[PDB]
Write a protein that binds this ligand. Structure first.
Ligand SMILES: O=N[O-]
Ligand SMILES: O=N[O-]
Ligand SMILES: O=N[O-]
Ligand SMILES: O=N[O-]
Ligand SMILES: O=N[O-]
Ligand SMILES: O=N[O-]
Ligand SMILES: O=N[O-]
Ligand SMILES: O=N[O-]
Ligand SMILES: O=N[O-]
Ligand SMILES: O=N[O-]
Ligand SMILES: O=N[O-]
Ligand SMILES: O=N[O-]
Ligand SMILES: O=N[O-]
Ligand SMILES: O=N[O-]
Ligand SMILES: O=N[O-]
Ligand SMILES: [Cu+2]
Ligand SMILES: [Cu+2]
Ligand SMILES: [Cu+2]
Ligand SMILES: [Cu+2]
Ligand SMILES: [Cu+2]
Ligand SMILES: [Cu+2]
Lengths: 332, 332, 332
């Protein structure tokens, strides 16, 4: 009887940050209430000023990470304002029935809907828009995110001992297929509707023009680099709603990795690089042991360094010479 | 001494259906006899009427699922009628030696051959034609299928408890590389031999023009949708002889998944999406919990919805509101 | 205190062969000294005589396999002679800190450097050059290899029992992106520097022109085929520094496979085909049971047979009819 369960309202935060939550559940099952507003907006995705008409949940690419526990109910109020122009919906890979909720959440501009589902399986899961006949277009325009369903007793290593993270980041990787004129220059349109046929043709090449973390080339760099300290335990959730990726932390490892994102399975140990299939979210746990700059990339290095799939960590603390040292510095 | 083992003759059925078999072996080892006839035929692969010269085992793309038990002998009589024009053979990834049987099964039109091999490893395995110097062409023209070698005591979960399926389907996913003229229109030829150089050039782009389930765009829809009931346990075998795929059941999960198809390994639990590498068969077990329509896709959603890699389940029975419900229906 | 540990100097050998080593460590921790000389050289990569300016560690593509044990120190003296023209460095995915050693190993032509790191995690790991702003170019020009860090007590099966290999081979798979003129012919340049902008454009297509084992089409064939005997236990280490691969032994299996290369994890059993993600090294153990020729391929069969990703084993010994036999040979 759901009416006797506690409700809690959660305010979502922008990726790569994640809303406050408990790892180990401090209450019984709850109904967890989220609200998201669909926003169609112009987005600049690279250093050259290339613009697309992005389709977003809550104004970001990716949409925000939702975090609940196993056997909670998720209640999502989804709003499509009349300033938008397209029909949207939502599919949760975490849910059971009705095309992930897709069949029940079709909202024209000016409408809203409230969906509830029970989070029966623990893991990280992709969510994405999926309107009938325009699925790939919506998803490759940025309309995806992820939900994390924690086990009620938190994460465990391969021996069943507890694993507790000190920080958590969410990296959404996005393939974009920006349409090109005859010579190879990117086209510009005034509305999402204008791009449609050109977008279908660009997608059919199966060759993205950009692959980015958090919505733009270099979004997770400089002032916006991810941070941590030597000694900290960091969980990095990574999603790709459409295409395979292979994350790698340059200078580090995935100590414990659930490459396909599902926590009832034991994690893979000591990974250098792991494969997250398109349509999946994955999670990697690392303990930092050296200070300095780290690059976190898609290890198709062309996709990383030419097409944009690269971010940075800045890590503070003490250097350990036992682990690594320059014996003789570069010299004639 | 094989001459003292029972023989049994099996008549194969068209995919996605699977010939009758016992999960748990009710006899000792047997020699299991199959016959297949190679058929070269014209096939219409999409709604636009695009035609290819397909190369088939037993008249279908994919070829039929063979099912035996561990330590059975498979005896396959393979017939190439004189109405065909090419040399064919067969390679079983389930077999040991002679290039999977490839070296011993070369049959010109007008010839036949009988091969026997012991099924020493349990799992689902790809079989495909592989004639010297034309391997990719034959395989990407549709000349592949799969064999399932069950453990003698049937399937087990990750704890070793029995898993029994109520139904089994076989989904063969096929990449096609139909050659294009200067403007992007599909070419047509009178014979398989005519297409050869154009086919090599199309393949070298590494970009398929179609990716289909069971031989055509929309083959597993409408009247030909897969069916089940709430409560039923369904095994879905999925093969791709040449290219990576990432299956996903929209509205469901892979409860138990052997993504690389080999049953001595424990299954992965609660998968949203899994990666079946090119040249592999995989198997996913799901128990339906909600009625309605489900889409079963390759979750590169472009490959699914634009290039054809999408099928449907129609599931009958009772709706469960605890799992999912619309609290407030789409409204102003 | 490193100064009291034994040192040992290892002379590296050309792939696919591997320097002599002990599986089970017969000493305590050591500092293991390697030297590599960077060589920029012209390389012919196919039967048509197509030439590239390759960037090599020690004159080969891939660079040589280094083999140490867990908790050894690796000390690498890396030399860039003044006959070269580019700045190079090295990143070890096996190491912790400073971008895998990348940050500490930048050597202009005429310089050398000596790096030391502790091999804290057991597995096979990729190493590759990664100079700031030219990472993909260096890696896809051939500047990668692998390091194997054995557990001190050698390899174990999924039950913890010892697995001992009789031979070990190293297969490096390389994607090349040779630039094409208007009509599709390969371009030629006098220096590496000349190709740069054309190389960036070729890479951005994400479509390689060649995919090879050991640096050329057909390098692991004929006189240079890998060999073994019926009964031998063979470890095949396989690396791809930039792009996904799916190895398959035609006529065989991966008895025990660590597809993502990390030995603290149990191996996957009875694999037909496995996925090694770009930026990873993997390892497969097989026991030969039949004599004859085997093809070892990337099982995207286009990549194998049209673009070059195929090698051979020649295996000697006794044929076993129980496993496989031709009952009726190809006949009218
Ligand atoms: O500006 N909206 O796509
Ligand atoms: O658009 N909200 O009713
Ligand atoms: O699904 N493309 O990696
Ligand atoms: O092919 N996906 O990186
Ligand atoms: O989804 N398996 O970690
Ligand atoms: O019609 N036979 O390709
Ligand atoms: O073609 N059968 O002999
Ligand atoms: O093998 N191509 O995914
Ligand atoms: O790249 N295969 O979907
Ligand atoms: O093939 N492993 O399920
Ligand atoms: O010949 N050196 O690229
Ligand atoms: O180039 N060695 O000093
Ligand atoms: O990373 N490309 O398979
Ligand atoms: O997509 N890599 O074979
Ligand atoms: O890296 N796992 O074998
Ligand atoms: Cu949408
Ligand atoms: Cu989906
Ligand atoms: Cu054939
Ligand atoms: Cu094969
Ligand atoms: Cu270099
Ligand atoms: Cu790397």
């Amino acid at each position: 009887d759901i009416s006797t369960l506690p409700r809690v309202k959660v305010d979502l935060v922008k990726p790569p940050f994640v809303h406050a939550h408990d790892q180990v559940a401090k209450t019984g099952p709850r109904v967890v209430e989220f609200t998201m507003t669909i926003e169609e907006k112009k987005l600049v995705i690279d250093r050259e000023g290339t613009e697309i008409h992005a389709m977003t949940f809550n104004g970001s690419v990716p949409g925000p990470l939702m975090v609940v526990h196993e056997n909670d109910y998720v209640e999502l109020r989804l709003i499509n304002p009349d300033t938008n122009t397209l029909l949207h919906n939502i599919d949760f890979h975490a849910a059971t029935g009705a095309l992930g909720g897709g069949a029940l959440t079709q909202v024209n501009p000016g409408e809203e809907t409230t969906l509830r589902f029970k989070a029966t399986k623990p893991g990280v899961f992709v969510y994405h828009c999926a309107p009938e006949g325009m699925v790939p277009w919506h998803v490759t325009s940025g309309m995806n995110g992820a939900i994390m369903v924690l086990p009620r007793d938190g994460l465990k290593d391969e021996k069943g001992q507890p694993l507790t993270y000190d920080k958590i980041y969410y990296v959404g990787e996005q393939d974009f297929y920006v349409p090109k004129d005859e010579a190879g220059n990117y086209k510009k349109y005034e509305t999402p509707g204008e791009a449609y046929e050109d977008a279908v043709k660009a997608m059919r090449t199966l060759t993205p023009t950009h692959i980015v973390f958090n919505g733009a080339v270099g979004a997770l760099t400089g002032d916006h680099a991810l941070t941590a300290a030597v000694g900290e335990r960091v969980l990095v959730v990574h999603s790709q709603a459409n295409r395979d990726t292979r994350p790698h932390l340059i200078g580090g490892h995935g100590d414990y990795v659930w490459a396909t994102g599902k926590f009832r399975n034991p994690p893979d140990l000591d990974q250098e690089t792991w494969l997250i299939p398109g349509g999946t979210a994955g999670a990697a746990f690392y303990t930092f042991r050296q200070p300095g700059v780290y690059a976190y990339v898609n290890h198709n290095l062309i996709e990383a360094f030419e097409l944009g799939a690269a971010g940075h960590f800045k890590v503070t603390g003490e250097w350990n010479d036992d682990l690594m040292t320059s014996v003789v510095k570069p010299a004639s």
